[PDB]
Design a protein around this ligand. Sequence first.
Ligand code: CL
Ligand code: CL
Length: 292
Amino acid sequence: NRITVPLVSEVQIAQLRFPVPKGVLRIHFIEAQDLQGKDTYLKGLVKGKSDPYGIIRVGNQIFQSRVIKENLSPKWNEVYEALVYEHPGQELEIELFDEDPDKDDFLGSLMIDLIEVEKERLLDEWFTLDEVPKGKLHLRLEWLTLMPNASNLDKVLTDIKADKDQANDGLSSALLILYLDSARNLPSGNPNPVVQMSVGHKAQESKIRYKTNEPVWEENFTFFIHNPKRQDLEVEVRDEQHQCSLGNLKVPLSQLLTSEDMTVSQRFQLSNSGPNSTIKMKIALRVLHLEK
Ligand SMILES: [Cl-]
Ligand SMILES: [Cl-]
């Protein structure tokens, strides 16, 4: 005969690791001057119709500028946003081409070291193009860091408004980083649950889970955010089998602006779902900031 007291505690069985951006590089693709024109043997009629455009690379992210026609001093005035991760020796790569009817001619290249850009926070400079006889490109580079509070949001939003360079998909004042853990007690008692997350027009999807009302995903996602004060995270759970909804969740990102470290982590009640139907997530907001 015994009286038994079990000594139980929470133990870390394992650990998921996901990459996170070290920051956001805002790239102003402004203009070039004195680019290489098209060669001829003797001088003649015409000078050669050059139509420059640029390809910009940061890691896996690629950006393509507009083609401006018949001009060796192109003026694009465009702006792109690239996520930057820890990756030693990583560079901003730029190649300029002439849009031709056949093979597009090469108009020069540029390779800038990021950890140099990070160090400078803000550049606004002319660079002499590499691998060409002549040509210079005008860039303005902003290295933006992640802040764990909304104290400076108001100013970046006004800067976004004042910035008049062309942005294909607008500019961002924040990143949304979230962890999709699992869901409980989904409808019917099975479906093949899949989650679709969106902020406005940005959309991303989880993997499919099969024949379960208790799906586990353990996936992480990152979204560019235009304006947290306005935008909602929309979460829809669907049955891949029958393409219908299993419930959804709308989360105004403004709620995060007033939370500790702008992060909430909880079980969320699903609407348009069963009773006690829920989804477990972590959701964090980080405001993009240019400091000195
Ligand atoms: Cl490239
Ligand atoms: Cl995005």
